[PDB]
Tab-separated table of C-alpha atoms in Angstrom:
chain	number	residue	atom	x	y	z
A	385	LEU	CA	126.180	106.244	101.132
A	386	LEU	CA	130.125	106.226	101.888
A	387	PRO	CA	131.236	109.233	100.021
A	388	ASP	CA	128.366	111.470	101.814
A	389	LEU	CA	129.744	110.143	105.113
A	390	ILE	CA	133.137	111.594	104.500
A	391	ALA	CA	132.139	114.766	103.302
A	392	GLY	CA	129.641	115.597	105.793
A	393	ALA	CA	126.597	116.005	103.579
A	394	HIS	CA	123.103	115.539	105.102
A	395	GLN	CA	120.873	116.200	101.983
A	396	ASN	CA	120.214	112.368	101.772
A	397	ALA	CA	119.094	109.526	103.823
A	398	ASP	CA	121.033	109.696	107.419
A	399	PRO	CA	121.997	106.426	108.877
A	400	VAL	CA	121.040	105.364	112.312
A	401	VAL	CA	123.455	105.279	114.856
A	402	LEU	CA	123.795	102.871	117.657
A	403	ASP	CA	125.863	102.909	121.005
A	404	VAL	CA	127.781	99.587	122.254
A	405	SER	CA	130.040	99.092	125.219
A	406	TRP	CA	133.636	97.951	125.027
A	407	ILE	CA	133.200	94.555	126.526
A	408	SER	CA	130.398	93.773	123.964
A	409	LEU	CA	133.032	93.564	121.114
A	410	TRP	CA	134.784	90.566	122.914
A	411	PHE	CA	131.331	89.002	123.973
A	412	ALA	CA	130.002	89.424	120.202
A	413	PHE	CA	133.267	87.724	118.962
A	414	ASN	CA	132.875	84.813	121.331
A	415	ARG	CA	129.194	84.335	120.187
A	416	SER	CA	127.867	83.326	116.613
A	417	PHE	CA	124.300	83.701	115.550
A	418	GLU	CA	122.429	80.455	114.091
A	419	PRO	CA	118.983	81.269	112.716
A	420	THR	CA	116.531	78.528	113.700
A	421	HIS	CA	113.205	79.897	112.541
A	422	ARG	CA	112.790	81.900	109.771
A	423	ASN	CA	110.022	84.588	109.679
A	424	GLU	CA	106.489	83.660	109.098
A	425	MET	CA	105.789	86.384	106.823
A	426	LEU	CA	108.695	85.679	104.043
A	427	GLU	CA	105.917	83.971	101.609
A	428	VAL	CA	103.150	86.608	102.224
A	429	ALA	CA	105.364	89.600	101.742
A	430	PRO	CA	104.798	89.878	97.959
A	431	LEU	CA	100.988	90.375	98.537
A	432	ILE	CA	101.419	92.975	101.112
A	433	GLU	CA	104.006	94.392	98.661
A	434	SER	CA	101.537	94.741	95.708
A	435	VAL	CA	98.381	95.965	98.244
A	436	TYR	CA	100.834	98.857	99.355
A	437	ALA	CA	101.683	99.732	95.972
A	438	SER	CA	98.097	99.698	94.676
A	439	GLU	CA	96.651	101.971	97.488
A	440	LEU	CA	99.728	104.413	97.001
A	441	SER	CA	98.704	104.685	93.153
A	442	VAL	CA	94.978	105.030	94.286
A	443	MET	CA	95.732	108.070	96.386
A	444	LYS	CA	98.129	109.620	93.898
A	445	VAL	CA	95.536	109.504	91.223
A	446	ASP	CA	92.735	111.157	93.455
A	447	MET	CA	94.903	113.934	94.477
A	448	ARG	CA	96.298	114.538	90.675
A	449	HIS	CA	92.448	114.749	89.658
A	450	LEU	CA	91.361	116.875	92.489
A	451	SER	CA	94.319	119.235	92.487
A	452	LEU	CA	92.406	121.498	89.477
A	453	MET	CA	88.972	122.081	91.340
A	454	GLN	CA	90.220	125.659	92.564
A	455	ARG	CA	91.152	126.665	88.981
A	456	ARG	CA	87.815	125.247	87.575
A	457	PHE	CA	85.519	126.780	90.031
A	458	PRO	CA	86.577	129.927	91.538
A	459	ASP	CA	83.141	130.837	93.107
A	460	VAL	CA	82.839	127.816	95.180
A	461	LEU	CA	86.511	127.519	96.323
A	462	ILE	CA	87.456	130.758	96.896
A	463	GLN	CA	88.781	130.345	100.218
A	464	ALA	CA	90.363	126.854	99.476
A	465	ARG	CA	93.763	125.767	100.444
A	466	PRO	CA	95.722	122.686	99.225
A	467	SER	CA	96.014	121.192	102.791
A	468	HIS	CA	92.085	121.115	102.535
A	469	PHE	CA	91.997	118.691	99.620
A	470	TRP	CA	94.968	116.741	101.294
A	471	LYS	CA	93.053	116.234	104.548
A	472	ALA	CA	89.888	115.087	102.336
A	473	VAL	CA	92.144	112.453	100.255
A	474	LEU	CA	93.697	111.255	103.707
A	475	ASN	CA	90.095	110.746	105.241
A	476	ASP	CA	89.054	108.065	102.687
A	477	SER	CA	92.243	105.991	102.624
A	478	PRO	CA	92.891	102.944	104.519
A	479	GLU	CA	94.361	103.157	108.129
A	480	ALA	CA	97.145	100.694	107.275
A	481	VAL	CA	98.885	102.726	104.568
A	482	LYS	CA	98.639	106.008	106.443
A	483	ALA	CA	100.112	104.045	109.487
A	484	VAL	CA	102.983	102.885	107.197
A	485	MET	CA	103.642	106.420	106.276
A	486	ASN	CA	103.369	107.748	109.836
A	487	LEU	CA	106.309	105.265	110.617
A	488	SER	CA	108.370	107.765	108.581
A	489	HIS	CA	106.750	110.876	108.925
A	490	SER	CA	106.435	110.927	112.652
A	491	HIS	CA	110.021	112.764	112.667
A	492	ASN	CA	110.753	113.806	109.452
A	493	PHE	CA	108.797	117.009	108.315
A	494	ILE	CA	107.063	117.217	104.952
A	495	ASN	CA	104.784	119.977	103.415
A	496	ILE	CA	102.568	120.846	100.196
A	497	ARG	CA	105.797	121.223	97.835
A	498	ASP	CA	107.094	117.693	98.839
A	499	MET	CA	103.723	115.870	98.138
A	500	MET	CA	103.192	117.834	95.112
A	501	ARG	CA	106.343	116.545	93.777
A	502	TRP	CA	105.118	113.124	94.770
A	503	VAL	CA	102.070	113.164	92.966
A	504	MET	CA	103.469	114.926	89.811
A	505	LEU	CA	105.983	111.801	89.504
A	506	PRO	CA	105.032	109.268	86.688
A	507	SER	CA	104.725	106.083	88.144
A	508	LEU	CA	101.640	103.743	88.967
A	509	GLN	CA	101.085	100.361	89.948
A	510	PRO	CA	98.634	98.760	87.615
A	511	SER	CA	95.682	96.754	89.222
A	512	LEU	CA	92.106	96.406	89.134
A	513	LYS	CA	91.063	98.979	91.586
A	514	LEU	CA	93.434	101.653	90.234
A	515	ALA	CA	92.282	101.080	86.643
A	516	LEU	CA	88.763	101.453	87.555
A	517	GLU	CA	89.561	104.674	89.624
A	518	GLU	CA	90.793	106.429	86.467
A	519	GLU	CA	88.111	105.329	84.179
A	520	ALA	CA	85.744	106.506	87.103
A	521	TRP	CA	87.469	109.931	87.078
A	522	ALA	CA	87.516	110.058	83.492
A	523	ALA	CA	83.997	109.495	83.291
A	524	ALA	CA	83.267	112.313	85.733
A	525	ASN	CA	85.221	114.781	84.194
A	526	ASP	CA	81.936	116.507	83.398
A	527	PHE	CA	80.539	117.771	86.279
A	528	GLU	CA	76.834	117.782	84.671
A	529	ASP	CA	76.697	114.052	85.011
A	530	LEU	CA	77.495	114.733	88.761
A	531	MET	CA	73.895	116.327	89.027
A	532	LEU	CA	74.920	119.984	90.265
A	533	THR	CA	75.124	123.041	88.078
A	534	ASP	CA	74.840	126.741	88.276
B	1274	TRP	CA	123.097	137.711	112.026
B	1275	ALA	CA	122.280	138.361	108.337
B	1276	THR	CA	118.529	138.672	108.305
B	1277	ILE	CA	116.435	141.567	108.081
B	1278	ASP	CA	113.974	141.043	110.888
B	1279	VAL	CA	112.328	144.135	110.741
B	1280	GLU	CA	110.170	145.432	107.496
B	1281	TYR	CA	107.357	147.524	106.514
B	1282	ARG	CA	104.659	146.615	104.160
B	1283	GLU	CA	101.280	148.660	104.100
B	1284	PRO	CA	99.935	151.682	105.973
B	1285	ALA	CA	98.569	150.082	109.160
B	1286	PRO	CA	95.413	151.195	110.914
B	1287	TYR	CA	97.224	152.753	113.830
B	1288	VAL	CA	99.544	155.534	112.026
B	1289	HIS	CA	102.127	155.371	114.891
B	1290	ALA	CA	103.309	151.622	114.677
B	1291	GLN	CA	103.930	150.770	110.882
B	1292	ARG	CA	106.589	148.033	111.548
B	1293	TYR	CA	106.499	144.364	110.977
B	1294	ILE	CA	108.623	141.740	113.086
B	1295	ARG	CA	110.181	138.691	111.469
B	1296	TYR	CA	111.698	136.723	113.756
B	1297	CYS	CA	114.749	134.138	112.051
B	1298	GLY	CA	113.535	135.539	108.654
B	1299	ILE	CA	110.572	133.177	108.613
B	1300	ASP	CA	107.131	134.725	107.597
B	1301	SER	CA	103.237	133.446	108.744
B	1302	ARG	CA	102.396	132.755	105.169
B	1303	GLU	CA	104.913	129.983	105.111
B	1304	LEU	CA	102.523	128.146	107.012
B	1305	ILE	CA	99.932	128.197	103.990
B	1306	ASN	CA	102.120	128.570	100.853
B	1307	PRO	CA	105.685	127.287	101.809
B	1308	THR	CA	108.698	128.265	99.567
B	1309	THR	CA	110.892	125.303	100.125
B	1310	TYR	CA	110.814	121.438	100.832
B	1311	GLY	CA	110.766	120.356	104.279
B	1312	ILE	CA	114.500	119.394	104.514
B	1313	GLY	CA	115.583	122.700	102.963
B	1314	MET	CA	114.045	124.786	105.713
B	1315	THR	CA	117.040	126.617	107.528
B	1316	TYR	CA	118.274	130.162	108.415
B	1317	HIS	CA	122.035	131.330	109.010
B	1318	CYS	CA	122.450	131.216	112.615
B	1319	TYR	CA	121.178	127.681	112.970
B	1320	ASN	CA	123.115	126.471	109.991
B	1321	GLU	CA	126.644	127.857	111.442
B	1322	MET	CA	125.615	126.383	114.607
B	1323	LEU	CA	125.475	123.095	113.256
B	1324	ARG	CA	128.678	123.586	111.261
B	1325	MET	CA	130.527	124.513	114.394
B	1326	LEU	CA	129.233	121.623	116.607
B	1327	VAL	CA	129.957	119.091	113.860
B	1328	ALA	CA	133.490	120.417	113.528
B	1329	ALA	CA	133.953	120.201	117.312
B	1330	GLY	CA	133.076	116.331	117.270
B	1331	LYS	CA	129.613	116.350	118.843
B	1332	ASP	CA	127.558	114.778	116.172
B	1333	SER	CA	124.830	113.243	118.212
B	1334	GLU	CA	123.738	117.025	119.487
B	1335	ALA	CA	123.963	118.074	115.866
B	1336	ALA	CA	121.533	115.285	114.824
B	1337	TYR	CA	119.368	116.118	117.562
B	1338	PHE	CA	119.190	119.903	116.836
B	1339	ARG	CA	118.764	119.113	112.829
B	1340	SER	CA	115.842	116.891	113.518
B	1341	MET	CA	114.310	119.756	115.854
B	1342	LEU	CA	114.713	122.694	113.556
B	1343	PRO	CA	111.480	122.737	111.906
B	1344	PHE	CA	109.695	122.569	115.130
B	1345	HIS	CA	111.557	125.693	116.482
B	1346	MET	CA	110.767	127.558	113.027
B	1347	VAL	CA	106.963	126.728	113.217
B	1348	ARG	CA	106.939	128.181	116.614
B	1349	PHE	CA	108.607	131.480	115.684
B	1350	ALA	CA	106.352	131.681	112.574
B	1351	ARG	CA	103.443	131.564	115.098
B	1352	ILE	CA	104.953	133.945	117.502
B	1353	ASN	CA	105.287	136.318	114.594
B	1354	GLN	CA	101.587	135.740	113.522
B	1355	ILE	CA	100.707	136.743	116.960
B	1356	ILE	CA	102.593	139.850	117.339
B	1357	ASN	CA	101.873	141.161	113.861
B	1358	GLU	CA	98.003	140.506	114.200
B	1359	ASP	CA	96.477	140.152	117.615
B	1360	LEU	CA	98.987	142.513	119.580
B	1361	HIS	CA	98.551	145.746	117.160
B	1362	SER	CA	96.953	148.311	119.357
B	1363	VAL	CA	97.226	151.901	120.608
B	1364	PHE	CA	99.291	150.863	123.633
B	1365	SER	CA	101.817	149.489	121.298
B	1366	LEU	CA	105.188	151.374	121.243
B	1367	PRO	CA	105.504	154.024	118.284
B	1368	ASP	CA	108.280	153.467	115.853
B	1369	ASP	CA	110.705	156.231	116.832
B	1370	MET	CA	111.185	154.842	120.481
B	1371	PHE	CA	111.496	151.293	119.116
B	1372	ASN	CA	114.402	152.348	116.801
B	1373	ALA	CA	116.124	154.514	119.598
C	1472	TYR	CA	101.470	124.894	125.394
C	1473	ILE	CA	102.444	121.718	123.339
C	1474	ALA	CA	105.162	119.304	123.601
C	1475	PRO	CA	107.144	118.144	120.586
C	1476	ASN	CA	106.509	114.603	119.421
C	1477	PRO	CA	108.346	111.917	121.391
C	1478	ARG	CA	109.420	110.001	118.285
C	1479	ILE	CA	111.533	112.855	117.251
C	1480	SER	CA	114.413	111.970	119.434
C	1481	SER	CA	114.064	108.017	119.267
C	1482	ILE	CA	113.413	105.672	116.809
C	1483	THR	CA	112.511	101.948	117.793
C	1484	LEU	CA	113.786	99.361	115.148
C	1485	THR	CA	112.429	96.435	117.270
C	1486	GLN	CA	111.222	95.314	120.593
C	1487	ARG	CA	114.621	95.398	122.440
C	1488	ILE	CA	116.755	97.784	120.149
C	1489	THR	CA	115.970	101.628	120.472
C	1490	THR	CA	118.091	104.711	119.675
C	1491	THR	CA	119.022	107.034	122.660
C	1492	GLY	CA	119.213	110.709	122.682
C	1493	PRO	CA	122.085	112.607	124.117
C	1494	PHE	CA	119.778	114.828	126.507
C	1495	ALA	CA	117.649	111.886	127.697
C	1496	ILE	CA	118.716	112.803	131.622
C	1497	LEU	CA	117.079	116.407	130.919
C	1498	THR	CA	113.957	115.371	128.987
C	1499	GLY	CA	112.821	113.060	131.838
C	1500	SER	CA	112.968	116.225	134.283
C	1501	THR	CA	109.492	117.858	135.412
C	1502	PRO	CA	109.404	121.543	136.295
C	1503	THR	CA	108.476	123.001	139.582
C	1504	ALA	CA	106.609	126.110	140.142
C	1505	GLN	CA	109.445	128.636	139.900
C	1506	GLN	CA	110.786	127.150	136.808
C	1507	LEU	CA	107.317	127.410	135.291
C	1508	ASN	CA	106.934	131.073	136.026
C	1509	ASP	CA	110.445	131.629	134.635
C	1510	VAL	CA	109.175	129.965	131.381
C	1511	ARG	CA	106.292	132.298	131.198
C	1512	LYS	CA	108.655	135.152	131.850
C	1513	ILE	CA	110.836	133.965	128.657
C	1514	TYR	CA	107.854	133.887	126.398
C	1515	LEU	CA	106.655	137.288	127.904
C	1516	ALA	CA	109.903	138.749	126.846
C	1517	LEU	CA	109.966	137.125	123.475
C	1518	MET	CA	106.466	138.352	122.576
C	1519	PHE	CA	107.407	141.797	123.202
C	1520	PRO	CA	110.817	142.617	121.388
C	1521	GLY	CA	112.094	145.580	123.073
D	915	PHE	CA	110.418	89.814	118.465
D	916	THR	CA	108.685	92.767	116.798
D	917	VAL	CA	107.008	95.711	117.834
D	918	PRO	CA	103.000	95.048	118.419
D	919	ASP	CA	101.957	97.954	116.298
D	920	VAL	CA	104.113	96.800	113.206
D	921	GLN	CA	102.471	93.483	113.534
D	922	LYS	CA	99.079	95.103	113.747
D	923	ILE	CA	99.578	97.090	110.725
D	924	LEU	CA	100.794	94.177	108.549
D	925	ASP	CA	97.665	92.144	110.037
D	926	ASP	CA	95.334	95.107	108.848
D	927	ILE	CA	96.807	94.559	105.599
D	928	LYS	CA	96.695	91.230	105.093
D	929	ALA	CA	92.931	91.475	105.799
D	930	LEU	CA	92.686	94.387	103.189
D	931	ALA	CA	94.129	92.075	100.616
D	932	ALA	CA	90.979	89.785	100.594
D	933	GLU	CA	88.347	92.855	99.885
D	934	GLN	CA	86.172	91.976	97.068
D	935	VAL	CA	85.485	94.930	94.351
D	936	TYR	CA	83.473	93.275	91.633
D	937	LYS	CA	80.276	91.282	91.440
D	938	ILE	CA	79.024	88.419	89.444
D	939	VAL	CA	75.336	88.590	88.241
D	940	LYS	CA	73.075	86.883	85.801
D	941	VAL	CA	71.289	90.137	84.672
D	942	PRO	CA	72.397	93.844	84.593
D	943	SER	CA	70.759	96.292	86.674
D	944	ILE	CA	67.815	98.297	85.210
D	945	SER	CA	69.015	101.642	83.151
D	946	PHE	CA	65.971	102.803	81.829
D	947	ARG	CA	62.283	102.760	83.143
D	948	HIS	CA	59.018	103.787	81.913
D	949	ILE	CA	56.135	105.863	82.999
D	950	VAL	CA	52.657	105.271	81.625
D	951	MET	CA	49.651	107.692	81.483
D	952	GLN	CA	46.268	107.483	80.222
D	953	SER	CA	47.713	107.483	76.488
D	954	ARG	CA	48.127	104.102	74.756
D	955	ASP	CA	50.664	105.050	72.296
D	956	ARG	CA	53.286	107.292	73.917
D	957	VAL	CA	55.245	106.809	77.260
E	1244	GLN	CA	88.290	127.272	110.749
E	1245	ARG	CA	91.567	128.534	110.156
E	1246	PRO	CA	93.747	126.942	107.484
E	1247	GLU	CA	96.832	127.548	109.575
E	1248	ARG	CA	95.314	125.117	112.378
E	1249	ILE	CA	95.051	122.361	109.898
E	1250	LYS	CA	97.321	119.380	111.067
E	1251	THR	CA	98.032	116.612	108.340
E	1252	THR	CA	101.135	114.805	109.737
E	1253	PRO	CA	101.685	113.711	113.273
E	1254	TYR	CA	105.254	115.780	113.381
E	1255	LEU	CA	103.193	118.742	115.049
E	1256	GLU	CA	100.888	116.572	117.288
E	1257	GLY	CA	102.093	116.456	120.941
E	1258	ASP	CA	100.667	116.442	124.382
E	1259	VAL	CA	99.304	119.391	126.199
E	1260	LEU	CA	101.351	120.783	129.113
E	1261	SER	CA	99.847	123.866	130.471
E	1262	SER	CA	97.546	126.960	129.170
E	1263	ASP	CA	97.673	130.948	129.822
E	1264	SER	CA	95.639	134.062	128.883
E	1265	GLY	CA	95.782	137.833	128.842
E	1266	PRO	CA	94.161	138.235	132.312
E	1267	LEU	CA	96.312	135.982	134.062
E	1268	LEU	CA	99.586	137.342	132.370
E	1269	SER	CA	99.223	140.969	133.066
E	1270	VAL	CA	98.790	140.233	136.765
E	1271	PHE	CA	101.654	137.900	136.927
E	1272	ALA	CA	104.028	140.451	135.236
E	1273	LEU	CA	102.586	143.170	137.605
E	1274	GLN	CA	103.295	140.864	140.532
E	1275	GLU	CA	107.077	140.131	139.432
E	1276	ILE	CA	107.827	143.750	138.811
E	1277	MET	CA	106.764	144.777	142.133
E	1278	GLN	CA	108.179	141.770	143.691
E	1279	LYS	CA	111.562	142.546	142.373
E	1280	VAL	CA	111.826	146.042	143.813
E	1281	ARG	CA	110.293	144.986	147.374
E	1282	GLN	CA	113.001	142.424	147.563
E	1283	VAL	CA	115.773	144.752	146.630
E	1284	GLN	CA	114.561	147.718	148.797
E	1285	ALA	CA	114.460	145.040	151.772
E	1286	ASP	CA	117.880	143.523	151.270
E	1287	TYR	CA	119.801	146.726	151.526
E	1288	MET	CA	119.707	149.979	153.792
């Protein structure tokens, strides 16, 4: 963080800047901060953390497997684009994970290349739902088991 | 400043207007198949403007413009798509007068 | 015509603390009739280059 | 305090943490069934 | 139905301010062009 501030490079996370007045410095010097109530979510945070990671991993696996359908079946998906399957995957994810991501994607722009790089990254959080989803995709590798053919 | 904003690709249906307009070096197909990451989108004049603003000590305005840049370029890409596709007609100006 | 997202120029860290944009005085203004007509003129000039 | 939208998000995640995926059964579901005709030897 | 109009991130989503079309803009341009010359010829001998 510090060497980037001196060199003026904005290719990484940009720190947030806040504005204060002059007399606020004296007022802050003459006032200390004494915590009197710890947060109600300290002991619940790890479970939320694990749930968030598991949902992200499930989304990654689903996209990774859906990205090959255009190459596999040219006739059905002749006019398909990556945004189509992106939107399709987003329509089945939970709303909470989408909201957490939108907290940052509201004022930072991303496109197909960023998220393709994200889904090619090798990191998953193992869980029950993730393992069963991976096995489900492996079982449904052959479309003949999905009862549709040409 | 250092961008080619008028090009020629393939013979148009109207033989008197062959040109294609590319404002700020962006193409319409970048809305479908982008060629760079979201943070990497830029062009020459906008980059020089941010550098000069930073050198002048106006950091907050530079941050605002850097945040607003992709919206600006998407707007100009949409304008390019409207010009090159919908407005192609016999009433469009021929190439010689446009050059002159 | 579509306005930009209001969250581009401001981030709310908590209930009381929010970042402030430099041009907040201009972003609060509302155009009249003549200013809107001038905006339409600007876009018309953009869409026909020469 | 905190923004009510973020509190709503955290409440939704906490609710989702208790969703039940598997089931506990005494017998598995039927996978093969048989159709009977006028024959007494083949189905 | 067009792939260009698909929005997947709320960055490009915003409020609606106004609308316009061809049959309005053409007559608007003609009105402004004629009004300018009428004003100029009225202001001076």
